[PDB]
Paper text:
Voltage-gated K+ channels of the Kv3 family represent an important subfamily among the 70 different Kv channel genes in the human genome, with specialized biophysical properties to sustain high-frequency firing of action potentials. The combination of ultra-fast activation and deactivation kinetics and high activation potential of these channels are key for their ability to repolarize the membrane and terminate the action potential.
To elucidate the structural determinants underlying the biophysical properties of Kv3 channels, we purified the shorter α-isoform of Kv3.1 from mammalian cells and determined cryo-EM structures under different sample conditions (apo, Zn2+-containing vs. Zn2+-free). We achieved 3D reconstructions between 3.1 and 3.5 Å for the different conditions, which show only minor differences in the overall structure, and no clear densities for additional Zn2+ sites other than the known sites in the T1 domain16 (see Supplementary discussion). In the following structural analysis, we thus focus mostly on observations from the best resolved structure which was obtained in digitonin and in the presence of 400 μM Zn2+ (representative densities for different regions of the channel are shown in Fig. S4). When superposing the TM region of Kv3.1a with the respective region in the structure of the Kv1.2-Kv2.1 chimera, the T1 domain of Kv3.1a is rotated clockwise by ~48° with respect to the T1 domain of Kv1.2-2.1. As a result of these differences, the α6 helix in the context of the full Kv3.1a channel is rotated by an almost 90° angle compared to Kv1.2-2.1, bringing it in much closer proximity to the S4/S5 linker. Consistent with the high activation potential of Kv3.1, the S4 helix of the VSD is in a less activated conformation compared to Kv1.2/Kv2.1 and Kv4.2, with only three (R1–R3) of the four voltage-sensing charges located above the conserved F256 in S2, which is part of the hydrophobic charge transfer centre (CTC) defined in previous Kv channel structures.
Residue numbers in the entry:
A (entry chain D), B (entry chain A), C (entry chain C), D (entry chain B): 7 to 120, 170 to 222, 235 to 295, 300 to 464
Write the structure that this text describes.
Amino acid sequence: SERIVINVGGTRHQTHRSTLRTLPGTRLAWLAEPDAHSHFDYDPRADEFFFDRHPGVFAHILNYYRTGKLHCPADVCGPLYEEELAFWGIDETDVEPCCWMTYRQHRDAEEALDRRWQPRIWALFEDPYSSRYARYVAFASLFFILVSITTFCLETHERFNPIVNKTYYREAETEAFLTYIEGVCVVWFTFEFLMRVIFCPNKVEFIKNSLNIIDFVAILPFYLEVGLSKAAKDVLGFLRVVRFVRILRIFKLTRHFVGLRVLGHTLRASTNEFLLLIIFLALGVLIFATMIYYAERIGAQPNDPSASEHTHFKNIPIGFWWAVVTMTTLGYGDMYPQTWSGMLVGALCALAGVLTIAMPVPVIVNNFGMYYSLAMAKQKLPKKKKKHIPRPP
Amino acid sequence: SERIVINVGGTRHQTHRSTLRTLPGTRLAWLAEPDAHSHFDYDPRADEFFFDRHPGVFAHILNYYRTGKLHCPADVCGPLYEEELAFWGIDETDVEPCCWMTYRQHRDAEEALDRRWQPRIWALFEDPYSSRYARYVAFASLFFILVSITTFCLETHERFNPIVNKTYYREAETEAFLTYIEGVCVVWFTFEFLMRVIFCPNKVEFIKNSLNIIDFVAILPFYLEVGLSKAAKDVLGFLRVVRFVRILRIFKLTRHFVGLRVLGHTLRASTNEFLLLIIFLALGVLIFATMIYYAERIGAQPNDPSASEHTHFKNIPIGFWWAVVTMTTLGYGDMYPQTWSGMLVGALCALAGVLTIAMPVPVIVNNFGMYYSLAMAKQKLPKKKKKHIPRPP
Amino acid sequence: SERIVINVGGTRHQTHRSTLRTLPGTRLAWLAEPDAHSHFDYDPRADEFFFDRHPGVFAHILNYYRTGKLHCPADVCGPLYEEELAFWGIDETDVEPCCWMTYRQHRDAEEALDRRWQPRIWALFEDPYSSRYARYVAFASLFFILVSITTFCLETHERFNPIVNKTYYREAETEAFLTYIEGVCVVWFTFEFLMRVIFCPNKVEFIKNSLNIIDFVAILPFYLEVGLSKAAKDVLGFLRVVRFVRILRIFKLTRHFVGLRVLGHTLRASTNEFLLLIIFLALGVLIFATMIYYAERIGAQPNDPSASEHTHFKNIPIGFWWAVVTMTTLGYGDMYPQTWSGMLVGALCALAGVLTIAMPVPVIVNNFGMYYSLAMAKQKLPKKKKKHIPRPP
Amino acid sequence: SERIVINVGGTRHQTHRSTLRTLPGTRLAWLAEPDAHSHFDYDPRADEFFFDRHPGVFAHILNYYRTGKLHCPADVCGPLYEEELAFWGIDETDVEPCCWMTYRQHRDAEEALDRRWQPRIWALFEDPYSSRYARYVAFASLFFILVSITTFCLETHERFNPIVNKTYYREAETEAFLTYIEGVCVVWFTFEFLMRVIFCPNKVEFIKNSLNIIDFVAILPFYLEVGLSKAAKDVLGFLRVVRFVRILRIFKLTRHFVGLRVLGHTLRASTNEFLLLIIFLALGVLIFATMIYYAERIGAQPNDPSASEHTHFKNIPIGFWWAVVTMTTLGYGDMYPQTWSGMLVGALCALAGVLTIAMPVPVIVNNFGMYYSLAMAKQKLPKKKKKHIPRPP
Ligand SMILES: [K+]
Ligand SMILES: [K+]
Ligand SMILES: [K+]
Ligand SMILES: [K+]
Ligand SMILES: [Zn+2]
Ligand SMILES: [Zn+2]
Ligand SMILES: [Zn+2]
Ligand SMILES: [Zn+2]
């Protein structure tokens, strides 16, 4: 009467029926009731109920019954404790904030990290290692993306844009070689795009796929040569700006990399820290721009009609630029303080920038480290054969 | 006789009566005395006293009785151990320094993180989400603060300050548009301020509130147009300097952010590390300024009458500026060593600066990380319903 | 029947025969079978099988039998748990990914960190502390390597390369003193190399040794003076480029240092993070170069025939250089944005560079820290005498 | 026979006599012998030996007996485990390298952190808080040290060194005010120094005290005015260089600070990491200086007689300066690559510098963090009254 002995995995836990009776609806509560002999495993020889569970954590569960606050035992992996409290009926959203960030850590990382010829057609878009043709087409598309990017970067150069005379417009024209190489790359990319269009299951998600969007936007300007006078000039002007995306085709290749998927998950999972960093920088930039603009006017020469003639800080927005360059410890040197007051404000800006940049960035860095370790583990670990054949219920 | 068996949560702990008798006044000490059968729960069948507590930590408490030094078991959350030793009577200020910083960690973070129409009137100052009018007034005050700040930053620009001729004073005058927008913003802010003044409970703390102080100081210069000749020029000169605070109205909006409250708590809780960083920087700056000023004179040309003509380091304070810019790895390039001795001193300055900046900043960064994790946890965790109905004493 | 009591190190673990029978082939499975009395140690008095093992981890092993997922107890060193599960028959490649990176940590670090006168001849190449002649030859080779390096660095100077007139070729010739010192150093190094050639066991690995390769490549140019007209000029031109390696002889001395061996192991063990860092930098550099080149053309003056006359960003590759200098927070200041659009892109470049540089570098830094702590431990720990005399099987 | 039951703190540990007999000379070994009933506490009723010790760690000690390798249980503070194994007789220098750096951590930090009127005379050198006169003399010496330093820094300025004509030597002379203030400060410091000389116990250590050395060296130049023609000019020239130490008197005041004592202990305890950092920087600087000097000559114009006319990298030592400025991400911009090859080498230099600077600096930073946390703990913790009255042996 009032003393009940729980036998968990061969370790006898003793407690009063009242302590079990505190938290109702849970399995131990039902144990405390007078109709428990039939309900649960029990032997009249020793008057102990037997549960075939880890005892080392049942200590902590029973502690939640005793004191009233549920904590995570720091000597067991989060998932192990999760499964134990799941069996005992304790709700997992009860743990104290002192032990919540380590408990809900692996599960946060885990959640963040998560007709006959049609297969052979689609095998050109599957993983490279999934076939030999796949690994060849992947190498070829890599070569052609690189050639496109190099053509772009060389097209913007001077050596390949000699000035010429047109009869009466004077301008610089691009070499023919570049246009020919661009045509070749467009032919290859359009062939690939048409072959991919051949098989397009769930065309809504195919259009929602950012990669295919980038491909089509990148292939639009060249194919607009036939389509393209007054509107034609504006559309060409925006067509150069569209061609600006042609470097974005490199993500098609780098998507199969692991570190980049981890980086995408890190970014999408650390929005709060990015917003925090941007707010810190905005406040710092504004405050220090105002401070330096006013400091640099103290020593202004009275003779000059303008308020500031000898200082780079002729207004506050210029202060914004200097404040960013100085807080990130970049320090180009295009504009710097030139008055003792300006120098004081500048030293404060450098130190405050180091601090308010080093506040949230370590949070973000720890997120990436955790996700990368987990992803590399899940990649390295050989595929299991589920050695444990579970017993029937 | 001399062998007493303590039954804690179904685990029998055995020890000599002397070990219990060492630390007097505590509950176990009273257990050791010969008048313990009535005082505590005890059965003559097994000669064991029964305590319904976590046994895994009673091991460590009894260890304090045995050896004489109290430690924190690194496998339980600090608050759990705190509550257990609180029950057993052990003083919490006895733990060894090896295990004090982790024990008193959550409790440090926790402490650092902590007439009919009058409600509807005050509802304009309450949280935005607390109503719909609140969220609208909040959006409107955001718009008007941003307009005030943009007017300020554009007022300091040249494009909006064209030079003019006044008849005989020559100066640049600000555009009328800016003055009109400023008047509009002042009208709105004064309306808000008067409505807030309508209801001001505990007016002493209302005046002590830094936000209301900033509001009044920011609204004083405009309203001084009517009040405002010899004293008037000085008060206008200081009025521009007062208007310098008008950018501080952005804290009124950003106070409801979480990262900023965490930053305020971090700053206020890491004063020692800030003083340490400032002392390190002062010693480094002084020492390296002297060293570089003397190094740069070794190669001074004898012909020149001045001691230093070819060096930027004409004196030591200039050295202060260079030493800050160089120790923070900023490196503007306005002044740099130009003598082999100067270059040696410069390399030492760069390395020593990296080191004495990276000494205390990680301490501060860890503080912010801990406070931010705890605050984000306490924000995310859904409000509890206190499932545990405590038993009557 | 169905209730089996395992006695591990004096702690009785109780469980059903089914739970043991789940995972077959393991020792506990064989325990569950009806032919277990003879097979294992067992007493009919208490009906318990006795195993003389750590019980605190047998809890977790039996937990793997019960639930079906094997975890690492965070309260025991990885090697201890490894040895226990090795005894019990559990495969070590079954642990959950939540507890794999800490389990397989020490073993990863450990694996990464791992005729009469012929002995006296070879004693000149052995460790310096291994003899007295060894420590003397080591000091002497240090002196001579340093003299060679100083001769090199001074040979490239102007003070030692005065212009002269040759009769009709005009050029600058190196001082004779440098050539004499070089000859002396070559004599010493060739004597050392010949003495080492005297004894060369496993000559294949001797040739595979990078140090001996560097020695021979460094000693080739001088000895080619006798060997060395049209081909002679090209071979001299490449001989200067070969002599460029003469600074690599410093690794011969620094190989006996500990931090450098740890750094070599860190590099070779963190290839993935290096590839990740290089990919991040390549994407960032490409993207930001394109963005800044296009941003800086928005404000281009229309009068100029060239597209860009007032900007340092005349093409995209120049953008590559600026993007590296700006993302590493180096910021020389040779080229910087000069247009409001350029300044926006520049601020984004600085922040994104800090982030994508601080992503993988902490992983690499943690690797080096772990390897260095382990190597310093293994160096400090005095050589053991294996106090534990193991019992015969 | 062969089965011995050890009762440690009420938990029965069972093991074979052979396992105890493995490690000889230790207490458990003596337990295993047949003459153990009299030697140790033992009851024939239960055939168990009773030890009044923590059982949770006796598990691990007995594990050392069983397997043969001693590990540290990660759930107990290092000192607790130290004291337990000290009682059991296990040598502490046996623990495995996997668990040595965490075991020997607190003890490393701890070791690193460690006639009638004569008392009133010496009370002027004792701690400021130790009296009222002490706190006053401390404030006064602070004021006078600051005045000396300000006089120094202003003496090197131009405003206070106007050029004058002496009749025939032309030079700039220092203002009289500075000399008068210097005389006053020297009078005060000499009075303090004489009063301290009054009482000088253990005069050998008084002379070995670096602070008194600095005081005497700083006070020597002024007092040499009376002592001080040909030798006089050289001694004055070195006297300015001696006066260079006058800024070192600030350590007299800052010695009572805590962060500085922690920094001194950190430096003295991290010599290996400093040597490692310096070696890394020397190799990096040498290698990259050579690489950039050779890279920048590829694009050298053939017309120029000199090898390099258009590059800042006219020789290799200049490369040393650039390599330091670039590896520390300082980047003054006085010299930077101007050739595509030079730019490649420069990008490599920036990245390699970040890496080989971030390798050992985190080790040093962790040392400082550990020492600072321990020192702040030992400072905060109130002085104990040793509640535990130990029992007589
Ligand atoms: K910089
Ligand atoms: K710069
Ligand atoms: K810089
Ligand atoms: K920097
Ligand atoms: Zn786990
Ligand atoms: Zn907790
Ligand atoms: Zn271990
Ligand atoms: Zn402890």
